[PDB]
Design an enzyme around this catalytic site. Structure first.
Site, PDB file in Angstrom:
ATOM      1  N   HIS A 174       0.807  -1.208   0.000  1.00 28.21           N
ATOM      2  CA  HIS A 174       0.000   0.000   0.000  1.00 28.21           C
ATOM      3  C   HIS A 174       0.851   1.274   0.000  1.00 28.21           C
ATOM      4  O   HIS A 174       0.290   2.359  -0.069  1.00 28.21           O
ATOM      5  CB  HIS A 174      -1.065   0.016   1.106  1.00 28.21           C
ATOM      6  N   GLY A 216       2.245   6.418   9.299  1.00 28.21           N
ATOM      7  CA  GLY A 216       3.671   6.301   9.026  1.00 28.21           C
ATOM      8  C   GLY A 216       4.339   5.076   9.639  1.00 28.21           C
ATOM      9  O   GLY A 216       5.458   4.727   9.248  1.00 28.21           O
ATOM     10  N   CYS A 243       3.477   1.983   9.257  1.00 23.96           N
ATOM     11  CA  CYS A 243       3.381   0.836   8.366  1.00 23.96           C
ATOM     12  C   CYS A 243       4.744   0.388   7.876  1.00 23.96           C
ATOM     13  O   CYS A 243       5.633   1.215   7.689  1.00 23.96           O
ATOM     14  CB  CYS A 243       2.412   1.116   7.226  1.00 23.96           C
TER      15      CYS A 243
HETATM   16  C1  LIG Z   1      -3.023   5.580   9.997  1.00 26.45           C
HETATM   17  C2  LIG Z   1      -2.548   4.255  10.536  1.00 26.45           C
HETATM   18  C3  LIG Z   1      -2.272   4.104  11.891  1.00 26.45           C
HETATM   19  C4  LIG Z   1      -1.894   2.869  12.379  1.00 26.45           C
HETATM   20  N1  LIG Z   1      -1.777   1.779  11.618  1.00 26.45           N
HETATM   21  C5  LIG Z   1      -2.050   1.915  10.315  1.00 26.45           C
HETATM   22  C6  LIG Z   1      -2.435   3.118   9.717  1.00 26.45           C
HETATM   23  N2  LIG Z   1      -2.947   3.187   8.401  1.00 26.45           N
HETATM   24  C7  LIG Z   1      -3.575   2.233   7.687  1.00 26.45           C
HETATM   25  O1  LIG Z   1      -4.352   1.420   8.180  1.00 26.45           O
HETATM   26  C8  LIG Z   1      -3.348   2.282   6.188  1.00 26.45           C
HETATM   27  N3  LIG Z   1      -3.303   3.629   5.652  1.00 26.45           N
HETATM   28  C9  LIG Z   1      -2.761   3.959   4.440  1.00 26.45           C
HETATM   29  C10 LIG Z   1      -2.312   3.007   3.549  1.00 26.45           C
HETATM   30  C11 LIG Z   1      -1.778   3.400   2.333  1.00 26.45           C
HETATM   31  N4  LIG Z   1      -1.659   4.654   1.931  1.00 26.45           N
HETATM   32  C12 LIG Z   1      -2.101   5.629   2.786  1.00 26.45           C
HETATM   33  C13 LIG Z   1      -1.970   6.979   2.389  1.00 26.45           C
HETATM   34  C14 LIG Z   1      -2.359   7.986   3.227  1.00 26.45           C
HETATM   35  C15 LIG Z   1      -2.896   7.701   4.475  1.00 26.45           C
HETATM   36  C16 LIG Z   1      -3.047   6.411   4.889  1.00 26.45           C
HETATM   37  C17 LIG Z   1      -2.655   5.332   4.057  1.00 26.45           C
END
Ligand SMILES: Cc1ccncc1NC(=O)CNc1ccnc2ccccc12
Ligand SMILES: Cc1ccncc1NC(=O)CNc1ccnc2ccccc12
Lengths: 304, 304
Positions: free
Chosen positions: B41, B143, B145
């Site tokens: 992603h 961030g 991830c």
């Molecule tokens: C926010 C967070 C906090 C903790 N664990 C995971 C996350 N985010 C997600 O679940 C996946 N989110 C995104 C996956 C790909 N591109 C993205 C682009 C802009 C924003 C978010 C994106």
């Protein structure tokens, strides 16, 4: 986004861990620049600990009696000296993995990470708080002595603790990196009173702020209180009295959540008086006090 | 000697963390040998996540679109490929800090350490358990991830988890290092049911053994039970049914303490039926399930 009892990444400290052997005693040392720091009780046998005369014991020791091994390589000891309860072993090689570092004497209620070691090898890392009674509730076995507590600010490692003793009560005592014990503890196998351990009120409040930020808000109520009213309740439940300095340090958390510090104090007052009623806060059934206001901010903003 | 929620020393994993940027998205990558592993992603914008066609999105990307930075140095990407939900970026340089490593797909109920990272920089380390419903209760922000979960056996790092998603419920989902999600989760910003989360019974029992070893024994009683009787109680309280495999794994702990597994089950049965009555076990007011029998043995014996 979740809230965990997070320790600092221990890599910078792992590269400083060495094994120090003197006679039949082996413990951990901290190798920074050309100096290895370890508890002075490395020169003691099991029987010496009952009543050791460290100055007399150290006089029967020469540089060649201290065996310092960093991984599989042997360090050459060219100097030895005692500073309070720590031995400083001057070696002929500066540790190439020495990070930017400071020695700091933390305050009770402050937190730090512990890298538990055995034979100079790291086994685990956990986050601790220096209790108001200057003990730490760690996880230490025979051989863990010399394991250190630290904090990290970007690239600077601030060493604050060196493990020395397990009190008969199962709690732990140790020193700062100048060899000064936290609290009234001595490096002697004798009965040592760890005084009354109070709950770190400012940390509980910081953790309540972390709970609100992360979704746990059932404990928020329609009440407020004053510092004096709250401290009457805090005294009854063996909590540290909350001061205006503590209120000020909680300022950023109060600003982020829009919940005034005294309103959070009223929630804490009701939790103290009524308990949790079988409920949890951030996965805990008790009031957590090992997160400072700085830890809560750091974790909630992702400071690396 | 104390019992703490200990994570593995994270040094070996810290040296593998890199920052991966694709377009306007920045997350963490794992650099092992000449390959950087990150969530696929990374190629998605905020709007793409609602319903992404990863194959179509990746086709508009070339090697030069993936910006990999390890500290202050830029890695040259010479290959890119998608394996399940992870991207594998072949770089022209092998990571000189690559530890001995394996990719392992852990079982639900097993534990692991998480090195939370932002922009390829480590901020903290904590110990997690893969829940029976294949979620993890971590601490992850925007961030984070690409942050990984792992275990360490002497010098070998077994990577088991890569963080990908935060579900609307605040719990976390991710993959093994082959890109296969744990559980039914998908890398799509949609409503995803995390099923019923049960308590890891074998871990609670292991933690009760750790409590007895470390002095906490108030909960030990004059009762015993059978596997079937215990499982009737376990089902009522959403605990995983205890099997003879679980009894067998608790064998070393039963041998060390002299308390038969079924007698420990009877203590757990009474704690489930009567609660803790305002008391604590190893500093906790609830039944802790994020220590496996192997963790309890490791911590109680000091395995480095
Ligand atoms: C926010 C967070 C906090 C903790 N664990 C995971 C996350 N985010 C997600 O679940 C996946 N989110 C995104 C996956 C790909 N591109 C993205 C682009 C802009 C924003 C978010 C994106
Ligand atoms: C056992 C332990 C566990 C956790 N934390 C600390 C410890 N031990 C101590 O308090 C100090 N013990 C010793 C200090 C010097 N020489 C010694 C020589 C043989 C044995 C023990 C010695």
């Amino acid at each position: 986004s979740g809230f965990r009892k997070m320790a600092f990444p221990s890599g910078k400290v792992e590269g400083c861990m060495v094994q120090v052997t003197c006679g039949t005693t082996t413990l951990n040392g901290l190798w920074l620049d050309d100096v290895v720091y370890c508890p002075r009780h490395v020169i003691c046998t099991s029987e010496d600990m009952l009543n050791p005369n460290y100055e007399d014991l150290l006089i029967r020791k020469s540089n060649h009696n201290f065996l310092v091994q960093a991984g599989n390589v042997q360090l050459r000891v060219i100097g030895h000296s005692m500073q309070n309860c720590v031995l400083k072993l001057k070696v002929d090689t500066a540790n190439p993995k020495t990070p930017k570092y400071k020695f700091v004497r933390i305050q009770p209620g402050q937190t730090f990470s512990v890298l538990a070691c055995y034979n100079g090898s790291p086994s685990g890392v956990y986050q601790c708080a220096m209790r108001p009674n200057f003990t730490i509730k760690g996880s230490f076995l025979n051989g863990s002595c010399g394991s250190v507590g630290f904090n990290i600010d970007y690239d600077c490692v601030s060493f604050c603790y060196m493990h020395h003793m397990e009190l008969p009560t199962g709690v732990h005592a140790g020193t700062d990196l100048e060899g000064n014990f936290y609290g009234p503890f001595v490096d002697r196998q004798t009965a040592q009173a760890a005084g009354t351990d109070t709950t770190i009120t400012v940390n509980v409040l910081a953790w309540l702020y972390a709970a609100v930020i992360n979704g746990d808000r059932w404990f928020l109520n329609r009440f407020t209180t004053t510092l004096n009213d709250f401290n009457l309740v805090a005294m009854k439940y063996n909590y540290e009295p909350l001061t205006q300095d503590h209120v000020d340090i909680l300022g950023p958390l109060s600003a982020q959540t829009g919940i005034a510090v005294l309103d959070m104090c009223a929630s804490l007052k009701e939790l103290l008086q009524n308990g949790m009623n079988g409920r949890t806060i951030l996965g805990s059934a008790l009031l957590e006090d090992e997160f400072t206001p700085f830890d809560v901010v750091r974790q909630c903003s992702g400071v690396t």
